[PDB]
Design a protein around this nucleic acid. Structure first.
Lengths: 158, 222, 171
DNA sequence: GAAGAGAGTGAGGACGAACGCGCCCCCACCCCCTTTTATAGCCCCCCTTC
DNA sequence: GAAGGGGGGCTATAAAAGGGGGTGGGGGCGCGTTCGTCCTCACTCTCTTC
């Protein structure tokens, strides 16, 4: 119950932590926290705003030690990708992780898929799937005033 | 003549031995090979009214150690050995004490500093981190210990309700080993559900109050 | 079990056999057959014959053979009333309701039929103790009488004051 | 006429019953187990290519 | 031996069954301290004694 309450309190305050992040600090598994999470909402008759891809960019990018411009580029990519519906049904975390990878590979600081997965808690396969979906529209997603250390045309293909 | 007897023959012969205090580096060099049968030569020179003792390090070993004698009248020292076959003996009696000193003064301390620094290698100091560690509490769907424990429980499965006759036979058979059993321990032996086991135990068994630890179940129906 | 497990099954099998309604006695060897204890030790065969089957209060020695003891156990309303009467007459004490229930099947019918003849005392653990209702001298009064009687505190008075009241009122 | 053991009183030291302080246990109460299903994403293990 | 892909699994969603297992709340119950009860002892009067 406490782990779910901690998750809900984070969501209510505008700084969500993913179920995996709450699980890492608790002996309770993600499955159990999610079960308690839904029950608490019914019991309290409350609701939580739907999470967005940008709700985790600050934590993920900072934890990856990525420059601020990369963080802004990743946020723009993730927001645009959802706007363009290039990743329908994908989890916001996966979209954010893919956007971070796309932004990271376009700057001097390059992070592997495993590195982005560890902080974000998303398996590299899921990042690979999301990255493949947004890769075709890479030039459009990137901010117009973005300095490409690696040209968009030469971004990793996979 | 017994195992604890000490072979005091050396004392009878009044054999004389010398006790020498030497630094580690001299012994460390000897310990390097320690099997060549040679580490150096001990040279003693005597004059009309003065005697000097000095030791020379082997040339191969290196790739002057003056000796100063000490008074031995203030204390009596004897040397004995413990044989591996449990046969203790007295090697002899110390007749003179000497000390080994380094000939060099200035550059010698350099080796001492390295020895101190070498002794400081195991010594450990706190280290600075330029960046904050972010690999702690990494997001995980379920803890590795939790899933392994669940896998073991799932594989093992829940205990089944065995027929009363089989359970009764097992309970009676185990009664021979010990007079009284604990409910928790008895469950492990029988490997049956607690509720079912208690009902079977209640049908015949009873619990006796003991003032030493607590009331425990007794397998004897009477 | 060796020297201890076999006897338990004999008692259990004997108890179950009586519940079927077979009052006929059974021999030691006969009982062993249905209890899968044919390989019982010889010294246990004599031990059960000499000690276990006689000292126990539920074993009756009839014509050499052994039979249950339903007579001692209460199995009728009249026996239930008689047992309580003897307990009161001899001052043996009450009997827990659970003990009567197991001995007397459908003890509720007998208990309700006797009605007030049985005095029930509720233990802290919900256990009921049955006592004979000695109808020699009875005295029941209204509740408020006891309330007023309880209102008259007497434990907090000394003997001198208690006895002084007698001469104070002139009695 | 002149003085010993013993006891009241003052006053100090050791051990048991009661009060906690929890260790353990027993007992409700709940959740989990299982199967079925379509769906979608996410994730992990094994096989394959280089 | 590193990395990608295929196959498989986990999760939620209802509902029902019956029973094992985990868990919170009491309830009798043994063990480490604490105070009162019991016991011990110094300093004098006293009846009795001489």
């Amino acid at each position: 119950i406490a782990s779910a309450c901690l998750y809900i309190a984070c969501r209510q305050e505008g700084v969500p932590r993913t179920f995996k992040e709450i699980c890492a600090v608790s002996r309770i598994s993600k499955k159990e926290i999610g079960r308690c999470f839904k029950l608490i909402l019914k019991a309290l008759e409350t609701s939580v705003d739907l999470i967005t891809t940008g709700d985790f960019m600050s934590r993920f990018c900072s934890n990856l030690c990525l420059p601020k411009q990369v963080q802004m580029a990743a946020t723009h990519i993730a927001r645009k990708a959802v706007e363009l519906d290039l990743v329908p049904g994908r989890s916001p975390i996966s979209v954010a992780a893919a956007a971070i990878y796309m932004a990271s590979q376009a700057s001097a600081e390059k992070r592997t898929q495993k590195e982005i997965g560890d902080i974000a808690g998303v398996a590299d396969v899921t990042i690979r799937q999301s990255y493949r979906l947004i890769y075709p529209r890479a030039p459009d997603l990137f901010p117009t005033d973005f300095k490409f250390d690696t040209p968009v045309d030469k971004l990793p293909q996979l | 003549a017994e195992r604890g007897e000490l072979d005091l023959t050396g004392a009878k012969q009044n054999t004389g031995v010398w006790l020498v205090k030497v630094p580690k580096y001299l012994s460390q060099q000897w310990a390097k090979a320690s099997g060549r049968g040679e580490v150096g030569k001990l040279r003693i020179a005597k004059t009309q009214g003065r005697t000097e003792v000095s030791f020379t390090l082997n040339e191969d070993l290196a790739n002057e150690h003056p000796f100063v004698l000490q008074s031995v009248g203030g204390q009596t020292l004897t040397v004995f050995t413990e044989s591996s076959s449990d046969k203790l003996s007295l090697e002899g009696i110390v007749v003179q004490r000497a000390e080994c000193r380094p000939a060099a003064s200035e550059n010698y301390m350099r080796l001492k500093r390295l020895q101190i620094e070498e002794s400081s290698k195991p010594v450990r100091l706190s280290q600075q981190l330029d960046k904050v560690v972010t690999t702690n509490y990494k997001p995980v769907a379920n803890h590795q210990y939790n899933i392994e424990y669940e896998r073991k429980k799932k594989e093992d499965g829940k205990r089944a309700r065995a027929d009363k006759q089989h359970v009764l036979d097992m309970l009676f058979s185990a009664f021979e080993k010990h007079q009284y059993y604990n409910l928790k321990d008895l469950v492990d032996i029988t490997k049956q559900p607690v509720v079912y086991l208690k009902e079977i135990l209640k049908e015949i068994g009873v619990q006796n109050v003991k003032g030493i630890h607590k009331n425990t179940w007794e397998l004897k129906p009477e | 079990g060796y020297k201890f497990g076999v006897l338990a099954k004999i008692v259990n099998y004997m108890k179950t056999r009586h519940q079927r309604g077979d009052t006929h006695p059974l021999t030691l060897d006969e009982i062993l057959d249905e209890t899968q204890h044919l390989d019982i030790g010889l010294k246990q065969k004599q031990w059960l014959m000499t000690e276990a089957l006689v000292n126990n209060p539920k074993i009756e020695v009839i014509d050499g053979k052994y039979a249950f003891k339903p007579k001692y156990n209460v199995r009728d309303k009249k026996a239930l009333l008689r047992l309580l009467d003897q307990h009161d007459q001899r001052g043996l004490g009450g009997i827990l309701l659970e003990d009567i229930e197991e001995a007397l099947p459908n003890s509720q019918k007998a208990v309700k039929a006797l009605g007030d003849q049985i005095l029930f005392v509720n233990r802290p653990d919900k256990k009921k103790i049955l006592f004979f209702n000695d109808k020699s001298c009875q005295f029941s009064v209204d509740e408020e009488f006891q309330k007023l009687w309880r209102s008259v505190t007497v434990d907090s008075m000394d003997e001198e004051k208690i006895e002084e009241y007698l001469k104070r009122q002139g009695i």
